[PDB]
């Protein structure tokens, strides 16, 4: 999952962005979920640094 695609997924689901893990980027294959790192739940979303305040991890499927 490219960093471009993670960022693209971020912008699409930004309104649903939360500390609870996102649904997954894809239904088939390997994707990504994302969430706001809990220490950053109070920050306005345009002030969440991608590197520090957003958690990702793979979402492995077939």
């Amino acid at each position: 999952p490219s960093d471009k695609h993670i960022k693209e997924y971020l912008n699409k689901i930004q309104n649903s962005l939360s500390t609870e893990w996102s649904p997954c980027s894809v239904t088939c294959g390997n994707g990504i979920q994302v969430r706001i790192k809990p220490g950053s739940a109070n920050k306005p979303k345009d002030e969440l640094d991608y590197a520090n305040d957003i958690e990702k991890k793979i979402c492995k499927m077939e």
Partner: antibody
Framework: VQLVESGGGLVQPGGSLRLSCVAS????????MNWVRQAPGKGLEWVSY????????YYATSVKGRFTISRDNAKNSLYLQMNSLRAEDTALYYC?????????????????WGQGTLVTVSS | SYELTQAPSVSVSPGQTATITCSGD??????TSWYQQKPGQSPVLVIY???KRPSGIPERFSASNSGNTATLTISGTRAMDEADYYC?????????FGTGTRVAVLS
């Protein structure tokens, strides 16, 4: 969506100026804002960035230490304090809206822009 | 500082396809945006995130970004497309604009 600049005018090298920008047509408190300038007949040059609650500020090397970006989200306004002005700061200064997520997260374009306000710095 | 390079001028006959280049050391790794600016007017967004068009922009615009080159393509160039086209990217907490390509439409 409208972004109306003002405060532009003529001034001499060493002087100071305060540009304003009143935003309407969207939720000001969820978008980062920018200043971009354009010398007459030349290209676009970004100037400064301000996040929605003013906790993240960036300046171009060409302006760092002389210009200061600020905003008053209750007055839906974006300011730029310009000090120690130089001739080459002569440009049209556009107030243009940034992304609703941080540029490091892909929201790294500028849209829309304002008609601009002219600043001429001349001896 | 990161430099985005562009050809200063391009000339195209109506109905022909125009290609505007934009170089960068590894521009493929960055999202590119494209702006259109007509004389006496504010710039306008025509491409965000390499190829997405802000709906409001005709389908004859389309853009790519791979390796060290992003490319705005205007197929069937109309007269109203005559303007200056700027590429743009994000680097080191900076917005970076290319020198701009003044596309002339020989109408």
């Amino acid at each position: 969506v409208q972004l109306v600049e003002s405060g532009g005018g003529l001034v001499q090298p060493g002087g100071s100026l305060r540009l304003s920008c009143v935003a309407s047509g969207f939720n000001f408190t969820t978008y980062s804002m920018n200043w971009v300038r354009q010398a007459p007949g030349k290209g676009l040059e970004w100037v400064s960035y301000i996040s929605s609650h003013s906790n993240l500020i960036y300046y171009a090397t060409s302006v760092k230490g002389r210009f200061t970006i600020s905003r008053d989200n209750a007055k839906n306004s974006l300011y730029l304090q310009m000090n120690s002005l130089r001739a080459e700061d002569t440009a049209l200064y556009y107030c243009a809206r940034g992304g609703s997520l941080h540029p490091s997260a892909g929201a790294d374009w500028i849209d829309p822009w304002g008609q601009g306000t002219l600043v001429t710095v001349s001896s | 500082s990161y430099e985005l390079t562009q050809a200063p001028s391009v000339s195209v006959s109506p109905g022909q396809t125009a290609t505007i280049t934009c170089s960068g050391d590894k521009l493929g790794d960055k999202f590119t945006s494209w702006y259109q600016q007509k004389p006496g007017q504010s710039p306008v967004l025509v491409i965000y995130q390499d190829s997405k068009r802000p709906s409001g922009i005709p389908e004859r615009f389309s853009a790519s970004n791979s390796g060290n080159t992003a490319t705005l393509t205007i197929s069937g160039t109309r007269a109203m497309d005559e303007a200056d086209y700027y590429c743009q990217a994000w680097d080191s907490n900076t917005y970076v604009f290319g020198t701009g390509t003044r596309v002339a439409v020989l109408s």
